[PDB]
Every structure is written in structure tokens, then in C-alpha cells.
Amino acid sequence: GIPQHQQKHALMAIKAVKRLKDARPFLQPVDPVALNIPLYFNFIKRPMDLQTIERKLNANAYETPEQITEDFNLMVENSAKFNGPTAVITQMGRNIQAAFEKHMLNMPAKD
Numbered sequence: 055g056i057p058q059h060q061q062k063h064a065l066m067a068i069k070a071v072k073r074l075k076d077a078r079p080f081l082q083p084v085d086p087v088a089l090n091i092p093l094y095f096n097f098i099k100r101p102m103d104l105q106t107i108e109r110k111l112n113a114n115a116y117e118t119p120e121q122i123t124e125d126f127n128l129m130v131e132n133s134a135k136f137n138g139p140t141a142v143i144t145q146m147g148r149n150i151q152a153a154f155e156k157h158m159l160n161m162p163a164k165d
């Protein structure tokens with residue numbers, strides 16, 4: 055797992071993103087049948103959401119900050135594939151992706 059200071063930085067980035075209206079579609083895992091999109095898991099083989107990223111950070115399940123960035127990008131790209139590249143949800147994902155990248159560019163180095 056990444057050292058404490060990087061873990062803290064990523065956690066603060068995630069909390070900042072969670073505060074945003076544009077995060078609302080991404081706060082929790084998708085339940086396809088509950089949303090009457092039963093083909094979701096046929097299209098999306100690696101579901102991802104903000105709660106999972108935060109829990110993984112708390113579980114020290116990331117080895118590098120780039121893995122966090124990869125999971126965030128995967129979440130947004132899942133929306134791009136399933137809802138469409140210009141769908142409302144996808145553009146909200148692009149917005150919070152920009153916010154998260156702003157917070158992650160400032161990630162402190164190991165040494």
C-alpha cells in the first residue's frame with residue numbers, strides 16, 4: 055500500500071469529489087436490475103465507483119497513485135461506453151475527472 059501521506063492526499067481528493075453535484079451518479083455501485091439496465095454487466099466487466107475507491111484507499115489496496123488514477127478513469131470510461139461518450143452522466147464524469155486530476159497533480163512524492 056502507498057505511504058500514509060499519499061493515502062491522505064488521495065482520500066482528500068476523493069472527499070472533495072464526493073462533495074460535487076457531478077459526482078452523484080458515481081457515489082455508489084451500479085445495481086443493473088434496480089436501474090432496469092439488466093445488460094450492464096454484459097457491457098461493463100470492471101464496474102467502479104467512488105465508494106469502492108475510497109474503501110480501497112482505506113484498505114491500503116493501492117500500490118501506487120497511478121492505480122488510483124486508473125480506477126477513476128475506469129469509472130468514467132465505463133460510463134462513456136455504456137451511457138455514451140456525450141451522455142449527461144458521462145459529462146458529469148468528465149467534470150469530476152477534471153476535479154480529481156487537479157487534486158492528484160499535487161500528489162506528494164515518496165521522498
Ligand SMILES: Cn1nccc1C(=O)NCc1ccc(-c2nc(-c3cccs3)no2)s1
Pocket residue numbers: 078079080084089091132133136137142143
Ligand atoms: C448506469 N450508470 N453508469 C454510471 C452511473 C450510472 C447510474 O445510473 N447510477 C445511478 C445514478 C444516481 C444519480 C444519477 C444522476 N443524477 C443526475 C443528475 C442530478 C442533477 C442534475 S443531473 N444525473 O444522473 S445516476
